[PDB]
Design a protein around this ligand. Sequence first.
Ligand SMILES: O=c1ccn([C@@H]2O[C@H](COP(=O)(O)OP(=O)(O)OP(=O)(O)O)[C@@H](O)[C@H]2O)c(=O)[nH]1
Ligand SMILES: O=c1ccn([C@@H]2O[C@H](COP(=O)(O)OP(=O)(O)OP(=O)(O)O)[C@@H](O)[C@H]2O)c(=O)[nH]1
Ligand SMILES: [Mn+2]
Ligand SMILES: [Mn+2]
Ligand SMILES: [Mn+2]
Ligand SMILES: [Mn+2]
Lengths: 286, 287
Amino acid sequence: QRVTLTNADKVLYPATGTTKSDIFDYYAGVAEVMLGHIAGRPATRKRWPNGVDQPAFFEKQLALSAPPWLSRATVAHRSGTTTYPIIDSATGLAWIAQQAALEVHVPQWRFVAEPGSGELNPGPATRLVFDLDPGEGVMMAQLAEVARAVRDLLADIGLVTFPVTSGSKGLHLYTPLDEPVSSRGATVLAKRVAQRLEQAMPALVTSTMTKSLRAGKVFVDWSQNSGSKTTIAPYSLRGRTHPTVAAPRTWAELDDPALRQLSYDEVLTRIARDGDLLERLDADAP
Amino acid sequence: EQRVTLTNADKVLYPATGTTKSDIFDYYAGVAEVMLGHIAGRPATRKRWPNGVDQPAFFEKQLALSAPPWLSRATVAHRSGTTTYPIIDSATGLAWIAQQAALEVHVPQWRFVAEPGSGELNPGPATRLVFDLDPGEGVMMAQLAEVARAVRDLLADIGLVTFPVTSGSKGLHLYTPLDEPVSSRGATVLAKRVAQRLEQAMPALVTSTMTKSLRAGKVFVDWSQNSGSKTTIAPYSLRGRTHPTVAAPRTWAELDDPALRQLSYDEVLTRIARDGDLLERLDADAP
DNA sequence: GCGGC
DNA sequence: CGCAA
Ligand SMILES: O=c1ccn([C@@H]2O[C@H](COP(=O)(O)OP(=O)(O)OP(=O)(O)O)[C@@H](O)[C@H]2O)c(=O)[nH]1
Ligand SMILES: O=c1ccn([C@@H]2O[C@H](COP(=O)(O)OP(=O)(O)OP(=O)(O)O)[C@@H](O)[C@H]2O)c(=O)[nH]1
Ligand SMILES: [Mn+2]
Ligand SMILES: [Mn+2]
Ligand SMILES: [Mn+2]
Ligand SMILES: [Mn+2]
């Protein structure tokens, strides 16, 4: 399981001058905290081999040139069959870094070993994700107002909620399901939460997806629980002009009106101090 | 009903001549009927220039996961690892080669064969010898031909026919069909001996020995191209040089020309019309 | 040139 | 970024 880094000093984030070597070291540092939330899960990559300025691509299928030691499982979808890599070692993330795969994306479900035979099919969703996407001119004080409303709705079913800023524009809320439930079921539940909130605070929340997002409201993206969709993984970098991170936050932080996204270097600092704030999210692991 | 969509039609791949992807596509469409027989049943190695002859290139042997399911494919087992190659055997296969910016197509001297009992394909014997003539420092294309002629006779003196093909590069290729096919090992044995009998017959102009440098004033007869693991630029293939030259089959009379030169895709097209396939007898069979 | 349902 | 030996 050697991974040779190449183009160490190649700048991928021109704005901040972030070389592949930083990124390699970043993913080396976040490894212990990150791995648990992507283990057992099919890794979708979004790659910027030529920096965040040159075009990028999504990649699901594991290339034929990908190192044999990587874990892999197949998903069967209407037309075609996709074999994804499963990242579950620090070396796996090393590969991800070398690959210039800034972003790692996962669904909310894990592969499970077939009782009799052995090899893996997609299993039930282990967690819900609430994908909060702010509208035009949507105040931060209010984005959290909503996140808190979601938390209080879920705790009224004995479910805990963890906020993670996306590294992008909005906010993600994860909820562990002690007893896993199929993605359709996950979708059903998320959808009911969204709709119950939309009703409880009409002026700030919408459950309905719109081709151009709605001004002044927060859109609760419940269909992110569809077993066929992925959400940016916790502790992943983003391919934005600045190397921000999908970063877990404490609830206390959400009370900050001047709340903002975090950079890879800052997250690193926090981990040292904090540990994995999402520790109880995926307390079982491949 | 295998389709190939051309993308980036007007994208110039040879800046010097302004030859766009669409020219190349059309070329391969045009050379298809004559080219296909010499590469059918053979593992296609591609050398690709997706950004013109000025941007870097790569060899590709393995058939990518992303390539169209309708391509033919067989597998070769080697040292460590296994390689599934594409087999080009229809104009559409060539279409794919063009869309792929795979200027060059390289093949070995052998074909896959259907397994007598089971069906699927393992490497078979070599169907033809190839003599790869590599001229040295200050070697006049004239004397390069005398050597080519000397090879023809040594071979005719065993009832074997010889077809010349200019590589589209610097030197010259000779193919000989083997009526009865023979393992590449044996093909190498045969070629090595022709080369050596030649080296002796004309000491001043030929060498059989591979030098790291290329020896001035002499023509090196590359016999080891008959090795089963090696490939030679396929006849009718484009080259990825500053100019869009081609591995062109030439008639013997042409080799007598001292001002004998390489040919461009356009010329090969006008030749093929008037000529048919000069190599028609080289591979009389296969898809 | 291609890499996502 | 990787694509042959
Ligand atoms: O075009 C898309 C859009 C979305 N997605 C998947 O859906 C997830 C959520 O899609 P979002 O559009 O909400 O983006 P985001 O949450 O990552 O960041 P912000 O909205 O805060 O700006 C993304 O993280 C990605 O995994 C795609 O794969 N492709
Ligand atoms: O580095 C190499 C060299 C050669 N080869 C393969 O073996 C053959 C060796 O052939 P040559 O190296 O002699 O080049 P050529 O005959 O194509 O062109 P000239 O000599 O006329 O300039 C080539 O046609 C190619 O298929 C490689 O695959 N890689
Ligand atoms: Mn979002
Ligand atoms: Mn969304
Ligand atoms: Mn040569
Ligand atoms: Mn040679």
